[PDB]
């Protein structure tokens, strides 16, 4: 049977707060920093 509960209906690990902070900041920072890398690559290309 599947596992249900608070934090157990999420794909990411919940039980450790600091690795959660690290993974959320790298995930949202990668999302934030993707268009900067795109625009610097078209600056480098042209």
């Amino acid at each position: 049977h599947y596992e249900e509960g608070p934090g157990k209906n999420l794909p990411f690990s919940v039980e450790n707060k600091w690795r959660l902070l690290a993974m959320m900041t790298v995930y949202f920072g990668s999302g934030f920093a993707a268009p900067f890398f795109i625009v610097r690559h078209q600056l480098l290309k042209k």
Binding site: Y2, E4, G5, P6, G7, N9, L10, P11, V14, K17, L20, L21, M24, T25, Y27, F28, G31, F32, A33, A34, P35, F36, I38, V39, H41, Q42, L43, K45, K46
Partner: protein, 514 residues
């Protein structure tokens, strides 16, 4: 096990949680794109050199946060999280097709990013007006990837709309009729109907554009008998129904938030609300040429379309009056969702009223493709639907996850977001009235000051979104679960507990015999 849950999913709650994750990712992507766009209009300069890459950034902003923030989060996440839970259905009628729609979304995101990646760039605005999007001004593989991204997003939205319509009409308890469902279910009913009655024109138009680019046809080349105004007609015949897609589940969420924390057991004038929303969903298809009052139409056509634009203006006013009359003498509790709702009502009202100012064709002759238009729709979209989605997420986050956000931090987020977005989008009224056109990387000196003010306001909104991650981290930094939920009787979604288990409605609801 992990793959069989989060990749092979066949229940609506986990799939909706994945829409929350993907929509949050795309929201930060488009937030960064908006930071760039306001970032070199603070000071007049070619910070990015040519403005082809600026148009690439603007097109990316528009596409990712129309089709990749607001539609996934709103439609997919809130429908898959709430529509089975309000109506009592255990699941959707077609869960595998819903999962295919969700998993079709990240290839569309990947092809949009790859469309931005190619050195020509798809810098042609949100509308894909040919032959700027043709094979001579945009000779490359980028806009073909943009078209295929729109194909994947449209097919995912069509499959989701099919599942939504069949699970509202068919997956309902038997003695409950259509006029006992909560108003968010009606919102996604008319919304999914307009998706399925709008997206085939978009798909046909962009298939036509792809065939014009590659297979040497001339639907949009006037040298072989085509007409670009055919694309304008087809695109906006899709587009204003898509506009009311972007606004109508926001109306449903706002109605639930307003009737919830005010203590009302029943929103005022339910049949009036339902009539107004079906009136919007019926009048959304005959109004589209208000986007083309400067193209060269016949004057009788323009008079008819501005008349029909006021006829679509009246039921929205009926809805906002019924909101102010379902606040009538209620036990109001100042949760942050009410702060988002009051911000929605006032700022969506002023944005829509500037839309009514833009509606008259004679004034739209001079106020076309200026920042007055940008102020109108950035009000309505960028904070009406935005504050509706934060009202919904802050309200249903104990239901979604289990833990609660801090009320002080959420009200501080409302304050910083309110100040930021109002400072960003207030002075561009005066910019557009002064005559500053849209899609401009650099401007003359006289448009400088308001631009600078608005740009630093955007940075304020940037600070706002930081607090968002912080306060959701604060939830997982506190693990504070709920005691109980108020007004649990009139809402079925709160009544299975926070958060609901994997299999809800194992034995379904019991209906009154009458």
């Amino acid at each position: 096990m992990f793959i069989n849950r989060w990749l092979f999913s066949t229940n609506h709650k986990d799939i909706g949680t994945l829409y929350l994750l993907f929509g949050a990712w795309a929201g930060m992507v488009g937030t960064a794109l908006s930071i760039l766009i306001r970032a070199e209009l603070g000071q007049p300069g070619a910070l990015l050199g040519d403005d082809q890459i600026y148009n690439v950034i603007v097109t990316a902003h528009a596409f990712v946060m129309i089709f990749f923030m607001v539609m996934p989060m709103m439609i997919g996440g809130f429908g898959n999280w709430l529509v089975p839970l309000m109506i009592g259905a255990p699941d959707m009628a077609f869960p595998r097709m819903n999962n295919m729609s969700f998993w079709l979304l990240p290839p569309s995101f990947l092809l949009l990013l790859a469309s931005s990646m190619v050195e020509a760039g798809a810098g042609t605005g949100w509308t894909v007006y040919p032959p700027l999007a043709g094979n001579l001004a945009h000779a490359g593989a980028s806009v073909d990837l943009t078209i295929f991204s729109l194909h994947l997003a449209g097919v995912s939205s069509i499959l989701g709309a099919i599942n939504f319509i069949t699970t509202i009409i068919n997956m309902k308890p038997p003695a409950m009729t259509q006029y006992q469902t909560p108003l968010f279910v009606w919102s996604v009913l008319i919304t999914a109907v307009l998706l399925l009655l709008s997206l085939p024109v978009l798909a046909a138009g962009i298939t036509m554009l792809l065939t014009d680019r590659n297979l040497n046809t001339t639907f949009f080349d006037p040298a072989g008998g085509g007409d670009p105004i055919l694309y304008q007609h087809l695109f906006w015949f899709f587009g204003h129904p898509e506009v009311y897609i972007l606004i109508l589940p926001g109306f449903g969420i706002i109605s639930h938030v307003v009737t919830y924390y005010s203590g009302k057991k029943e929103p005022f004038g339910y049949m009036g609300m339902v009539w107004a929303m079906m009136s919007i969903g019926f009048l959304g298809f005959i109004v589209w040429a208000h986007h083309m009052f400067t193209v060269g139409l016949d004057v009788d056509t323009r008079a008819y379309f501005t008349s029909a634009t006021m006829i679509i203006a009246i039921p929205t006013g009926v809805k906002v009056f019924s909101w102010l009359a379902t606040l009538h003498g209620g036990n109001i509790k100042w949760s942050p969702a009410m702060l988002w709702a009051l911000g929605f009502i006032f700022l969506f009202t002023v944005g829509g009223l500037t839309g009514i100012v833009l509606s008259n064709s004679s004034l739209d002759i001079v106020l076309h493709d200026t920042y007055y238009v940008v102020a109108h729709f950035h009000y309505v979209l960028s904070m009406g639907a935005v504050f509706a989605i934060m009202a919904g997420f802050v309200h249903w986050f104990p239901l979604f996850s289990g833990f609660t956000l801090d009320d002080t931090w959420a009200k501080a987020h409302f304050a910083i977001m309110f100040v930021g977005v109002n400072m960003t989008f207030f002075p561009q009224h005066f910019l557009g009235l002064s005559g500053m056109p849209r899609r401009y990387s650099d401007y003359p000196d006289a448009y400088t000051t308001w631009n600078t003010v608005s740009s630093m306001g955007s940075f304020i909104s940037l600070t706002a979104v930081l607090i968002m991650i912080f306060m959701i981290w604060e939830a997982f930094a506190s693990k504070r679960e709920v005691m109980s939920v108020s007004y649990a009787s009139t809402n079925l979604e709160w009544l299975h507990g926070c958060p609901p288990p994997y299999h809800t409605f194992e034995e379904p609801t019991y209906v009154k015999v009458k």
